[PDB]
Amino acid sequence: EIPEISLPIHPMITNVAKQCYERGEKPKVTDFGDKVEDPTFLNQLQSGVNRWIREIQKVTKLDRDPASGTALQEISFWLNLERALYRIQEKRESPEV
């Protein structure tokens, strides 16, 4: 039972995203106004995405021993990896990320 990782998002981004959601409008970079230019905000974002890369590497570099262990563990292993990576890519492809 391979763990799952919920990738965090900057809450301010979600605030403006929900504000774009209260009305019928797609979220975009232009909506932050003069907030994109904040080196503090972008530095926070850089740190967050760096943590995301760390978290995903924790799952993508995973592998088990094909020699030992039961065969069922290997079959279930590859299936669980597909589930993990499938949910990971859906988290990645979200409009917030």
Binding site: V36, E37, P39, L42
Partner: protein, 37 residues
Amino acid sequence: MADPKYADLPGIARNEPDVYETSDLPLTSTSVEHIIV
């Protein structure tokens, strides 16, 4: 971006157009027959 970073180094040219660009601008028929009598 990093505006103070550009304030640090001396070569970054400000107030110059960053992108130079060129101007923009705005099956056959069937039954080909031929009788013969």
